[PDB]
Swiss-Prot record:
Name recorded for this polypeptide: Transmembrane protein gp41
Organism annotation: Human immunodeficiency virus type 1 group M subtype B (isolate HXB2) (HIV-1)
Bilayer topology term: Single-pass type I membrane protein
Task performed by this protein: Acts as a class I viral fusion protein. Under the current model, the protein has at least 3 conformational states: pre-fusion native state, pre-hairpin intermediate state, and post-fusion hairpin state. During fusion of viral and target intracellular membranes, the coiled coil regions (heptad repeats) assume a trimer-of-hairpins structure, positioning the fusion peptide in close proximity to the C-terminal region of the ectodomain. The formation of this structure appears to drive apposition and subsequent fusion of viral and target cell membranes.
Summary of subunit composition and partner proteins: The mature envelope protein (Env) consists of a homotrimer of non-covalently associated gp120-gp41 heterodimers. The resulting complex protrudes from the virus surface as a spike. There seems to be as few as 10 spikes on the average virion.
Region (MPER): 6-27
Superkingdom classification of source: Viruses
Segment of the intact protein contained: 657 to 683 of 856
Entry-listed glycosylation sites: A18
Subcellular location: Virion membrane; Host cell membrane; Host endosome membrane
Length: 27
């Protein structure tokens, strides 16, 4: 099994910060 201690579960978080796809809503 794999909980949130594996780098994979934490890897999606590093990608989260760069979620700058909501900035386009503000033209």
């Amino acid at each position: 099994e794999q909980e949130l201690l594996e780098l994979d579960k934490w890897a999606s978080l590093w990608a989260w910060f760069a979620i700058t796809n909501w900035l386009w809503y503000i033209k």
